[PDB]
Design an enzyme around this catalytic site. Structure first.
Site, PDB file in Angstrom:
ATOM      1  N   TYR A 242      -9.136   4.757  -3.067  1.00 29.90           N
ATOM      2  CA  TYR A 242      -7.793   4.296  -3.381  1.00 29.90           C
ATOM      3  C   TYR A 242      -7.005   4.128  -2.109  1.00 29.90           C
ATOM      4  CZ  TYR A 242      -3.108   3.976  -5.483  1.00 29.90           C
ATOM      5  OH  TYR A 242      -1.846   3.562  -5.864  1.00 29.90           O
TER       6      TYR A 242
ATOM      7  N   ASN B 269       0.792  -6.580  -8.536  1.00 33.29           N
ATOM      8  CA  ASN B 269       1.004  -5.188  -8.890  1.00 33.29           C
ATOM      9  C   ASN B 269      -0.204  -4.513  -9.549  1.00 33.29           C
ATOM     10  OD1 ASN B 269       2.778  -2.834 -10.431  1.00 33.29           O
ATOM     11  ND2 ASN B 269       1.686  -4.161 -11.889  1.00 33.29           N
TER      12      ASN B 269
ATOM     13  N   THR C 137       4.937   7.955 -14.023  1.00 32.88           N
ATOM     14  CA  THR C 137       4.228   7.201 -15.041  1.00 32.88           C
ATOM     15  C   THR C 137       4.149   8.134 -16.250  1.00 32.88           C
ATOM     16  OG1 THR C 137       2.826   5.337 -14.265  1.00 32.88           O
ATOM     17  CG2 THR C 137       1.693   7.119 -15.450  1.00 32.88           C
TER      18      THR C 137
ATOM     19  N   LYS D 270      -5.573   0.486  -0.415  1.00 34.36           N
ATOM     20  CA  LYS D 270      -4.138   0.339  -0.268  1.00 34.36           C
ATOM     21  C   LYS D 270      -3.762   0.043   1.188  1.00 34.36           C
ATOM     22  CE  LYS D 270      -2.648   0.648  -4.500  1.00 34.36           C
ATOM     23  NZ  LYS D 270      -1.910  -0.479  -5.193  1.00 34.36           N
TER      24      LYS D 270
ATOM     25  N   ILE E 163       5.047   7.864  -8.831  1.00 31.42           N
ATOM     26  CA  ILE E 163       5.980   7.336  -9.809  1.00 31.42           C
ATOM     27  C   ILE E 163       5.743   7.943 -11.170  1.00 31.42           C
ATOM     28  CG2 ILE E 163       6.858   5.298 -10.987  1.00 31.42           C
ATOM     29  CD1 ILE E 163       7.448   5.649  -7.947  1.00 31.42           C
TER      30      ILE E 163
ATOM     31  N   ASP F 202      -1.932  -9.555 -17.361  1.00 32.31           N
ATOM     32  CA  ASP F 202      -2.546  -8.237 -17.449  1.00 32.31           C
ATOM     33  C   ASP F 202      -3.997  -8.310 -17.930  1.00 32.31           C
ATOM     34  OD1 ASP F 202      -2.980  -5.294 -18.419  1.00 32.31           O
ATOM     35  OD2 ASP F 202      -0.990  -5.282 -17.435  1.00 32.31           O
TER      36      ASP F 202
HETATM   37  N1  LIG Z   1       2.059   4.871 -11.112  1.00 30.97           N
HETATM   38  C1  LIG Z   1       2.095   5.494  -9.810  1.00 30.97           C
HETATM   39  O1  LIG Z   1       2.193   6.700  -9.710  1.00 30.97           O
HETATM   40  C2  LIG Z   1       2.005   4.616  -8.550  1.00 30.97           C
HETATM   41  C3  LIG Z   1       1.249   3.485  -8.593  1.00 30.97           C
HETATM   42  N2  LIG Z   1       1.132   2.644  -7.490  1.00 30.97           N
HETATM   43  C4  LIG Z   1       0.756   1.321  -7.668  1.00 30.97           C
HETATM   44  O2  LIG Z   1       1.743   0.658  -8.587  1.00 30.97           O
HETATM   45  C5  LIG Z   1       0.901  -0.411  -9.250  1.00 30.97           C
HETATM   46  C6  LIG Z   1       1.085  -0.351 -10.711  1.00 30.97           C
HETATM   47  O3  LIG Z   1       0.647   0.891 -11.234  1.00 30.97           O
HETATM   48  P1  LIG Z   1       1.479   1.546 -12.432  1.00 30.97           P
HETATM   49  O4  LIG Z   1       2.539   0.621 -12.918  1.00 30.97           O
HETATM   50  O5  LIG Z   1       2.314   2.719 -11.997  1.00 30.97           O
HETATM   51  O6  LIG Z   1       0.383   2.013 -13.551  1.00 30.97           O
HETATM   52  P2  LIG Z   1      -0.065   1.230 -14.890  1.00 30.97           P
HETATM   53  O7  LIG Z   1      -1.473   1.523 -15.244  1.00 30.97           O
HETATM   54  O8  LIG Z   1       0.671   1.777 -16.058  1.00 30.97           O
HETATM   55  O9  LIG Z   1       0.144  -0.343 -14.747  1.00 30.97           O
HETATM   56  C7  LIG Z   1      -0.866  -1.096 -14.108  1.00 30.97           C
HETATM   57  C8  LIG Z   1      -1.222  -2.265 -14.937  1.00 30.97           C
HETATM   58  O10 LIG Z   1      -2.248  -3.084 -14.203  1.00 30.97           O
HETATM   59  C9  LIG Z   1      -3.207  -3.466 -15.270  1.00 30.97           C
HETATM   60  N3  LIG Z   1      -4.499  -3.678 -14.755  1.00 30.97           N
HETATM   61  C10 LIG Z   1      -5.422  -2.709 -14.413  1.00 30.97           C
HETATM   62  N4  LIG Z   1      -6.545  -3.310 -13.971  1.00 30.97           N
HETATM   63  C11 LIG Z   1      -6.404  -4.674 -14.014  1.00 30.97           C
HETATM   64  C12 LIG Z   1      -7.243  -5.770 -13.681  1.00 30.97           C
HETATM   65  N5  LIG Z   1      -8.577  -5.563 -13.179  1.00 30.97           N
HETATM   66  N6  LIG Z   1      -6.740  -7.008 -13.854  1.00 30.97           N
HETATM   67  C13 LIG Z   1      -5.495  -7.224 -14.325  1.00 30.97           C
HETATM   68  N7  LIG Z   1      -4.673  -6.211 -14.654  1.00 30.97           N
HETATM   69  C14 LIG Z   1      -5.084  -4.948 -14.515  1.00 30.97           C
HETATM   70  C15 LIG Z   1      -3.221  -2.325 -16.193  1.00 30.97           C
HETATM   71  O11 LIG Z   1      -3.745  -2.698 -17.498  1.00 30.97           O
HETATM   72  C16 LIG Z   1      -1.815  -1.858 -16.217  1.00 30.97           C
HETATM   73  O12 LIG Z   1      -1.076  -2.513 -17.288  1.00 30.97           O
HETATM   74  C17 LIG Z   1      -0.505  -0.167  -8.890  1.00 30.97           C
HETATM   75  O13 LIG Z   1      -0.878  -1.137  -7.865  1.00 30.97           O
HETATM   76  C18 LIG Z   1      -0.542   1.177  -8.349  1.00 30.97           C
HETATM   77  O14 LIG Z   1      -1.663   1.390  -7.445  1.00 30.97           O
HETATM   78  C19 LIG Z   1       1.412   3.085  -6.238  1.00 30.97           C
HETATM   79  C20 LIG Z   1       2.200   4.177  -6.055  1.00 30.97           C
HETATM   80  C21 LIG Z   1       2.798   5.017  -7.273  1.00 30.97           C
END
Ligand SMILES: NC(=O)C1=CN([C@@H]2O[C@H](COP(=O)(O)OP(=O)(O)OC[C@H]3O[C@@H](n4cnc5c(N)ncnc54)[C@H](O)[C@@H]3O)[C@@H](O)[C@H]2O)C=CC1
Ligand SMILES: NC(=O)C1=CN([C@@H]2O[C@H](COP(=O)(O)OP(=O)(O)OC[C@H]3O[C@@H](n4cnc5c(N)ncnc54)[C@H](O)[C@@H]3O)[C@@H](O)[C@H]2O)C=CC1
Ligand SMILES: NC(=O)C1=CN([C@@H]2O[C@H](COP(=O)(O)OP(=O)(O)OC[C@H]3O[C@@H](n4cnc5c(N)ncnc54)[C@H](O)[C@@H]3O)[C@@H](O)[C@H]2O)C=CC1
Ligand SMILES: NC(=O)C1=CN([C@@H]2O[C@H](COP(=O)(O)OP(=O)(O)OC[C@H]3O[C@@H](n4cnc5c(N)ncnc54)[C@H](O)[C@@H]3O)[C@@H](O)[C@H]2O)C=CC1
Ligand SMILES: [Mg+2]
Ligand SMILES: [Mg+2]
Lengths: 253, 257, 250, 248
Positions: free
Chosen positions: B164, B97, B199, B168, B197, B44
């Site tokens: 975004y 992810n 979140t 994607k 999702i 992360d």
């Molecule tokens: N949360 C949602 O509503 C949805 C999200 N997504 C995708 O699911 C994936 C995960 O998102 P979530 O779990 O839901 O949100 P989230 O923000 O809680 O988790 C994403 C994690 O990726 C980390 N991160 C961000 N930038 C980074 C970087 N430059 N390098 C390394 N790590 C990094 C963040 O610190 C975070 O812990 C993403 O790819 C997102 O685009 C797609 C559809 C639904």
């Protein structure tokens, strides 16, 4: 937790269950502790499958079914509710086949034969599956067996391609209708699968089919069975209305 | 034998690297691999969030280690992969992810630097991940599996989110081409398309705004991280041995209509 | 109504207009009576193209453009509005490229060049084109040049496929935003186009991917582009239109 | 190179040509100079359309057609070939309709009605147009009329959605088959078109980012483009004419 018993207390209807993907899926449902209804046009072949299931300690029963005849479908679903007390899961898998020919020369009867089984049959299957599952009414899950040819075309099989596209659409509309009442409906699109008859093709042809799959091989029935049984399972609770490929990247190019 | 091996040992031995794994889908996915017996690398941008995830995995009795990662930096990506191989002795499964995010505004008014930040994290980042993941997997070479976390917005668009949405779609692109390169080398490559999702942070938003999102999903609710992870881990598994080059929805039937 | 005066009075900016598809689109816009801005990284090639159109009775003017630089895209749009009074129409066609390599060994800087021109270029194109079309303000139309590789992959070309998929995405999102404001935004997906003297069987290799049994011509893509631009396509928006000889149908 | 003569000396068959998109397609082919075979289940409607085109300097002839019956389709194709010497172009537009019900409650006879017309009808059409267009040696063009519902679902219309999906299907396989022999086969995916209810109409509109419904002329323009030589490298593909409906 666990795979061995995730379908305990559940009744799964599988059409075309005597052969191929149907049989492989019947067996996968059994390995998960489901109660399997083996349904096929081949009456004795469904009995053979279901007897083999029972001989490995799975609860299962055979029923004769023709998907083209709405009342045969309705009866099969009645048999399932009669035999195991409910209907929870369905795999609409019955299908042919069809001769190869350019659209302009394609036999009219062959066309209807194909569409009636592959498309109409799935519609009839859901037509009666849904009330029985909904009335239950513990929610439920349906998987329709489509094909890669439900999303791309294939020279010489216009009827088959048509039907299979149709299964995809049948899946989307139905899922839009039922998702909120807790019934998930999805479809799978497998690539070309190893079968006894496909393993009778000559070297040139089989090789041709193979080269269309970047994976470098054809698929196996079991491999389609795993995708289907996943989408049926509670793990896929947010998977609805969607079409899931299992094609060795055939459609990725 | 899959049924003989069962659930808890499905992934025993296999090393799995997960980016963005401090929360959301990444954390849930890290947990689901662990429960199946995988050795887990929590990567992360939030280094403290990583360590916390790994530690709490370890108390749950999972083998796990954290690493700081910034997918925008190829060098950071390489080191993270090397960390996994150095720590557990291979790399077998990986889940790209990590992502953001980005402001909401029409294309004509969209902040340029904001566009850059979104595409580099969301699209470039996935390409870098794969860029360094693949050789690590290939060299070993027992085959392996990679899942790319795109989104519904990788197959449809959304007003106000063009950076975004574009990134994607790009991820779906990466997945197809990469999967056609590697499917015959035993490396399977796929994407998932989660719908919206649940979140934690999008319950702070309006009653209305939330409901508008919910009405976009025929299933009548938003998704849970655990539900995406379930799909991600099936794609990674030997059960999906013939699944490659494909995009898999985990939405409300969002894209069905 | 007529074809030769179909775009009469409307101004049209075409990127990468000095060669290939951009050039053919420029010519086809001209034959329809459009005012045309020939924007291209190769400034000399753009001027040569502008000149040829002028020889055909077409109002046209050349401008040096790097779609890679946001300030340059902006100026290119400004040049359009200054020269001909307005911006009505735009074709985002400037793109490369990308050497071949499996994703696991792909050249990182090469990935960078490909994405920046093909994806970012299109985004920056639309970023400055839209406010100008909007403020006009009688509406307009934009077509982004994607590819078959915007919907299917191609082994050895991860960066290009990625960038072209991005373009499809940028197209849907922008079109969702602007549809109601009377600005239609679409994408085209050409198959491989005769742009020549490859390894003999390598060309045949490319040809065998097209059930039409030949490659496409530039003009052929341009026809579809110009159709989508026209008022004939008044209810066409957010859509991706293939011109690929059935490449993606199988 | 001459809007009014784009299709001069070319024969076009249109199914469902007595009303809506098929009527508008016919008029657009006519304004482009084409010989137009107006085909419909409504004999009187087809005849009133051909007569109107004729009054406009367009060579047109009407024929009764029931697309669910393969023999009726063959007779229409032959009627075009006989009347105008050969066939070059076809629009397969005849369609209905269908009641609204969830899948589990859907009427069996109606499902059939919808599939028989909308899917089988298109296949039967193609099955008879292809060898005819092949005969003329000159290689023509066929457009099939799918829908947005050829690619997305819609609650309450399972039969329709399935059928429209099968159209896109037929289009892809037939085009794969025929592209090399110089026949391009494509499909159009129209969104909702003004061709009734309270403010349910308002609900429809809101499903199209465009902010309005489509006009049958707007569909016609795309169809006729696809039929034209300007679409010469366009084959096997599905073309939306929706309000960005499917884009979100
Ligand atoms: N949360 C949602 O509503 C949805 C999200 N997504 C995708 O699911 C994936 C995960 O998102 P979530 O779990 O839901 O949100 P989230 O923000 O809680 O988790 C994403 C994690 O990726 C980390 N991160 C961000 N930038 C980074 C970087 N430059 N390098 C390394 N790590 C990094 C963040 O610190 C975070 O812990 C993403 O790819 C997102 O685009 C797609 C559809 C639904
Ligand atoms: N084998 C392949 O390569 C692929 C097959 N599929 C589909 O998977 C499904 C099953 O495929 P396979 O196992 O390989 O074929 P199969 O021949 O091995 O199995 C077909 C079974 O369905 C039964 N059946 C046939 N017609 C029926 C009817 N009218 N009513 C009830 N039951 C009937 C048959 O008795 C037979 O046992 C089919 O829908 C097929 O279209 C789709 C994609 C790949
Ligand atoms: N060549 C082909 O067969 C196909 C090409 N395409 C796409 O069509 C578009 C144009 O293709 P072609 O006509 O073949 O290219 P081309 O090589 O014939 O001409 C491209 C033009 O864009 C200009 N250009 C390149 N980079 C630029 C930049 N950063 N800023 C401003 N201008 C720039 C060039 O100077 C050139 O005049 C590309 O986006 C390409 O991806 C898509 C499918 C098939
Ligand atoms: N109006 C809409 O919202 C949309 C309609 N479509 C499709 O475009 C096509 C044209 O529809 P519309 O113009 O809107 O409706 P329409 O009612 O105005 O035209 C239908 C025509 O086809 C004829 N027809 C019906 N059944 C027939 C049969 N069995 N054999 C021969 N002819 C028959 C009818 O007599 C009628 O003249 C249909 O296929 C429809 O599914 C697709 C997308 C949007
Ligand atoms: Mg939608
Ligand atoms: Mg293909």
């Amino acid at each position: 937790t666990g795979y061995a018993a995730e379908f305990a207390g559940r009744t799964a209807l599988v059409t075309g269950a005597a052969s191929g993907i149907g049989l492989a899926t019947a067996r996968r449902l059994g390995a998960g502790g489901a109660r399997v209804v083996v349904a096929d046009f081949n009456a004795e072949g469904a009995e053979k499958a279901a007897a083999e299931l029972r001989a490995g300690g799975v609860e299962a029963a055979a029923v004769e079914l023709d998907v083209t005849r709405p009342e045969s479908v309705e009866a099969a679903v009645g048999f399932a509710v009669d035999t195991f007390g409910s209907l929870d899961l369905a795999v609409n898998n019955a299908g042919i086949g069809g001769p190869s020919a350019p659209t302009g020369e394609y036999d009219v009867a062959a066309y209807q034969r194909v569409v009636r089984t592959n498309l109409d049959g799935v519609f009839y299957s859901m037509r009666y599956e849904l009330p029985a599952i909904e009335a239950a009414g513990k929610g439920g899950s349906i998987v329709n067996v489509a094909s890669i040819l439900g999303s791309v075309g294939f020279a010489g099989s216009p009827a088959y391609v048509a039907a299979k596209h149709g299964v995809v659409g049948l899946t989307k509309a139905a899922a839009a209708e039922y998702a909120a009442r807790g019934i998930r409906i999805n479809a799978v699109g497998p690539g070309f699968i190893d079968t006894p008859l496909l393993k009778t093709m000559e070297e040139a042809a089989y090789k041709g089919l193979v080269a269309l799959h970047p994976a470098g091989r054809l698929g196996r029935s079991d491999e389609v069975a795993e995708l289907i049984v996943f989408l049926l399972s509670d793990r896929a609770s947010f998977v609805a209305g969607s079409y899931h490929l299992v094609d060795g990247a055939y459609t990725a190019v």
